Amino acid sequence: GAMGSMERASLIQKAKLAEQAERYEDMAAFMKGAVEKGEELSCEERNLLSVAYKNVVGGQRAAWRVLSSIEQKSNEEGSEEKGPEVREYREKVETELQGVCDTVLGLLDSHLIKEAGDAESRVFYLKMKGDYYRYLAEVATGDDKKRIIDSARSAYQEAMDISKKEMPPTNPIRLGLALNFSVFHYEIANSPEEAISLAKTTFDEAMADLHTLSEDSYKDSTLIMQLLRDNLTLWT
């Protein structure tokens, strides 16, 4: 890879610079290079990896949604035909998005997940795996849409099982996992009641555990609890 000649520590340092510069494609490439050094990632390094690709795919997803909306309008009654260009460019963005998702899933499979033994790392990576299959599912339409959906569900479910056994209900990784699994249920799996039940139970169990936390941990947990609350307000 193009980062194979750069020191692991230099790649991590440059990932942090790229974040400050809001250069998230650079950040992702640096962190991909760091993963490919073959050593496990620390907590801070895992979060750098996640932030980088979240921002890259976030921009791709936003663009895909703009283009898909334009495409769908062009296919309504009375719409003037403007040729293949809208579909072509939507497919271009979609293919680039899928390539990023495939890259992340490839890193997780080679070999982040199999070497992740601690609950905090294993849950983190399995959540990521569910997230990037979910992003694939957002754009999927063909023979393997159901398998993509079930791959997201399976990854989220294994992460949930571990997190419930090994993590307190206020753990921010556990909370963000439950948040995203609930979004999966609502937006991908056509299961809004499951989405709502998971968000409410997650919120309530974290509420009851806040008294154990320091002020700093309390702030971390309540931040994600508010996102659960925001979604419940949207959904109910």
């Binding site: 932030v51 979240k54 909370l175 996992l177 948040l179 995203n180 979004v183 925001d230 979604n231």
Partner: peptide, 5 residues
């Protein structure tokens, strides 16, 4: 819906 970072 809001998802995590």
């Amino acid at each position: 819906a809001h998802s995590s970072x």
